[PDB]
């Protein structure tokens, strides 16, 4: 099965007037709480030079997190300043690719913090809220180069569940206290000589179903195209993949998906279940934001 | 198992000391054979090349210009008093370098390295175009990133313009609908460790079409930074797949003005054309002079 | 036109034994010799998990590798023993003896392994012992006194010269000796391949297996993400310094959970393979934790 | 018509002395001057083996080159001393002073050597000392402020200019000076030849020797497997920048066991050669471990 885009034009785009989202808005975390779609999007003040040996001050780019409430989920409302920015020098180049999970009655935002001192100088980072507004308690989740981090919305046997991507696999780990992680296991690997050969990473947090946890994920071919796949995690044991779909659910097809700051990228940091429907919010070409949907009942393996 | 043969063991173009532009080096030239004439567009430098400072320093500034030269025989060229292309301040303040010219339909495209001199990564691929080889227009940054060794394929593939470029250290391909926005970036060729082409490789001139594929002359740099040329063959209908790559170089520094010069141990081509079932390969030597070497088309087998 | 190894079991054939300190966490990277119609397995064994991310090897995370012995008729089911057959000498091998490769040359058996001192992450070298019975190892010497590993002896001399395969980072090396003590004629014989599974480094697997068309050179290849797979090349029979064929695609990759997950993830690694009844039996460590075995019919080996 | 050197002895003429820490492991790559009917030999000496295969020079494998003095009447039997005559200054030459080549220039003696700081593998440069008497050295300076080695001085000015041979990789370079501090008009003199015994790199051996027919340029060449062999070229007597002759094949190459096996296998390397009784004496390091001497009659030198 495939996702279907709602709009064949970006539902959000950069705002050249605001320096902080000047060149890019993409990779957005999203929650459905106030019967509205609460979208937290990566935003860049510059284009992305990636081919240098080390990140260069000449080509510095700063990621930021912007908010965007919407009632129907297609037309959004935005604000003049970011809702999250780097405040310690390990986020010098900013805060990237947030994933938001709410556990008990707190909202947790996992994102990558990038220091620009080298291309490994990035950390999984977490802040938390109780309202989605006042983000306190900054911590580095793992003291290691790692990203594509989400939290499972439930605890499993009283342990918090973190998904991450030690290169190039999707990993699970477990916490007593959201501080120390142990029992790191690989859960899913890239498949060679396919669209998902180079690496894979979780998209948005897994979405609970009756039959398992929905693992929307991205896959990178060895020409660095980002597409989206789908897999199912055992509900009792999210460390086991009980199914996974061969072909992708979303790949670059529109021109603002193929062409843009980093071409041939579709990338989701956030999905939501709304009206028997899944709403998948994907950065396109690391420049704009799109949204695509599936009818819950058409999800089958 | 072939190599080029030099038509002369002396430069065919050399710097002109009376001209400030082109006072110290003429090298890395684009080539078009149009209407019985060899149309040469040569990188030209007003100054020696000091590259061992931490940043480009004004006291060591060099300016690359593009000169033009024309010939009937490929050997004796008419030259002109002034360069046909120079750099726009600020992004091209230290000049415009290593042009590669591709005709597509009835237009001509000059991809070159604009260099701003504000740091050693202050360069990019740029493109200007003309329909006449005389009036260049429409400068655009091809990729807004530190990249070079770029050239356009002489025709489209599946309705798409084909860019070759060199994100360090490989030869990349890429595709465009509009000659502005590029996608489908793919690595196509890589250095080989423990060879003359171990440190890096880049495309030479644009690929020359054949019946058996695209002729991909390229340069390879060894661990000692020696520039040599070698050849590959790209698949005719998909130029991103290599189908043959010769092991040994086709041209390497051999003559004193290829080994010694402003940058020692360099032969470097930005251009080769087909004339009379021969391939003419023009090359800078030591980043200081231009020579030309040939190979009979019949001798190009892998 | 590529060939793969096929696993004999989807479960490991040797796993750690928790009553034995010297093997209570890992058994892997094993040499193998087939003699007296028995598979003789000399496996690496760790008393601890492997913390490798520290600036120096820390006593608080010390691991000790020993070499245990297992024997089998069918190459699948093994008899094991209480005590290891090789341990490290102190202090040069205080962190033990790793990745043994056993070569028989003229009714003497040569075990090459990495002695690891633990004093820093470069405190390792190629070591050798020998025996005439596979039981009483003697003659310890440092083959090459440098940080080096993935070493194996060729099963016969070439022009009167002993032949050593080693691995100065990141290529497979070769060298020659008149006396099994002093090595000369060093030469790179094979190199990693950029933008492939074997791009970071390569290293010999088990000692090469003689064929009519050359020497079978199973090797391991390390990708950018540190995944260890197995590949295969063919060496020239009379001049094993020359690679005359090399399969592009691996012959074995981490696939099963005890190969992908373990003390070191994403690892398949062979220190030994033997030929029995026109089949190649390749024993391999798996996630530096267990031992599996894959086979190939030799008629399927085609380059 | 190829010509080659003839070893005077199947024995080294200088060996390490294990009781002297500074020359414990290696004496090699020696300069030599013939003065006072004496062979004056200034030899590089190492306190340690040579671990060369690490990505970076590591203080745990540090080796220190000093330069020792030895004298002989007969050219074979040398008298030696307790302590070195020159050592590396900390920190610019922290890993010592290598490969001296001594040129006499109007009753002065100039010793050019490679100083090596061991902070990275390009942490080396050409340094120069001089003396009045081959005894009281002074005047130390960094000849070129760049990674460079294999340096010698011509024994007289050319057009009133001091002449320097150096080796910007991989070629032999020449350079000119007025003051022996500033060098200019650098240009490539000679280059390796791919797919021969001298394909990887070349470098000068001893300072050129004056002949009526030009300047004898013994040089070393390195093949794809880092074997070091001595070659011979001839430079125009009035313009030593022009190579007027070059023998295709080596004049010396590792043959004896203490030239094949050693701290650095497969190396003969000469930093000095003198003419005595119409005969060239070529002192050479062997395996970076010992010093030998090979000769060739003057009249046999022919291109
Ligand atoms: Zn505004
Ligand atoms: Zn942070
Ligand atoms: Zn990812
Ligand atoms: Zn004029
Ligand atoms: Zn420009
Ligand atoms: Zn590459
Ligand atoms: Zn290039
Ligand atoms: Zn070659
Ligand atoms: Zn027991
Ligand atoms: Zn040992
Ligand atoms: Zn290598
Ligand atoms: Zn290895
Ligand atoms: Zn593959
Ligand atoms: Zn003494
Ligand atoms: Zn010095
Ligand atoms: Zn040298």
């Amino acid at each position: 099965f495939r996702l279907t885009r709602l709009s064949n034009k970006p539902i959000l785009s950069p705002i050249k007037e605001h320096e902080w989202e000047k060149e890019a808005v993409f990779n957005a975390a999203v929650i459905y709480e106030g019967n509205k779609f609460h979208l937290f999007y990566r935003a860049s003040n510059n284009k992305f030079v990636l081919n240098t040996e080390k990140p260069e001050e000449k080509y510095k780019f700063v990621s930021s997190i912007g908010y965007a409430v919407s009632e129907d989920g297609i037309n959004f409302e935005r604000f003049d300043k970011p809702v999250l920015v780097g405040e310690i020098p390990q986020e010098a180049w900013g805060v990237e690719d947030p994933r938001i999970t709410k556990i008990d009655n707190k909202y947790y935002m996992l994102y990558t913090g990038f220091g620009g001192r080298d291309w490994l100088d990035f950390r999984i980072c977490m802040v938390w809220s109780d309202d989605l507004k006042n983000w306190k308690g900054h911590r580095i989740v793992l003291d290691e180069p790692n990203k594509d981090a989400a939290l499972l919305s439930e605890k499993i046997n009283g342990k918090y569940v973190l998904f991450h991507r030690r290169m190039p696999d999707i990993w699970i780990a477990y916490s007593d206290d959201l501080v120390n992680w142990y029992n790191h296991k690989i859960i899913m690997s890239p498949k060679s000589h396919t669209w998902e050969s180079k690496k894979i990473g979780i998209a948005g947090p897994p979405i609970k179903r009756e039959d398992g946890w929905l693992l929307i994920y991205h896959g990178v071919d060895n020409n660095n195209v980002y597409r989206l796949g789908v897999a199912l995690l055992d509900l009792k044991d999210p460390s086991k993949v009980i199914a996974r779909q061969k072909e992708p659910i979303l790949e670059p097809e529109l021109d603002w998906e193929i062409n843009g700051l980093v071409p041939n990228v579709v990338f989701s940091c956030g999905a939501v279940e709304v009206n028997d429907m899944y709403y998948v919010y994907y950065g396109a070409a690391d420049t704009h934001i799109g949204v695509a949907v599936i009818e819950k009942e058409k999800v089958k393996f």
Side-chain angles (χ1 to χ4, degrees), chain A residues 153-201:
Chain A
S153 41
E154 296 175 8
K155 300 174 247 257
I156 299 278
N157 193 51
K159 325 293 164 151
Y160 301 92
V161 177
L162 160 79
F163 297 90
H164 58 95
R165 187 222 59 189
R166 291 172 180 177
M167 196 79 182
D169 307 293
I170 296 176
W171 291 67
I172 213 158
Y174 302 85
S175 192
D176 294 342
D177 55 24
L178 285 181
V179 172
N180 315 291
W181 299 88
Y182 61 95
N183 286 346
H184 296 272
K185 296 158 66 180
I186 287 161
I187 265 66
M188 211 166 69
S189 295
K191 296 203 262 205
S192 88
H193 307 292
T194 74
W195 64 276
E196 45 180 344
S197 64
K198 206 142 178 282
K199 42 181 196 206
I200 51 159

Side-chain angles (χ1 to χ4, degrees), chain A residues 20-22 24-26 41-45 62-66 95:
Chain A
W20 63 277
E21 42 175 353
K22 184 183 66 220
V25 301
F26 66 125
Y41 59 93
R42 208 181 149 178
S44 187
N45 72 336
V62 185
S63 312
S64 296
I65 291 319
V95 303

Side-chain angles (χ1 to χ4, degrees), chain A residues 120-132:
Chain A
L120 293 177
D121 182 29
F122 58 95
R123 290 299 172 262
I124 295 165
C125 294
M126 184 168 85
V127 291
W128 55 270
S129 267
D130 45 32
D131 44 25
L132 284 178

Side-chain angles (χ1 to χ4, degrees), chain A residues 88 90-91 125 138 140:
Chain A
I88 78 159
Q90 214 282 321
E91 306 158 329
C125 294
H138 160 279
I140 289 164

Side-chain angles (χ1 to χ4, degrees), chain A residues 10 22 24-25 33 56 61 69 79 84 121 141 168 182 212 237 288:
Chain A
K22 184 183 66 220
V25 301
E33 202 82 63
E56 293 288 341
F61 57 90
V69 46
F79 310 77
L84 202 78
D121 182 29
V141 175
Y182 61 95
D237 187 359
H288 318 264

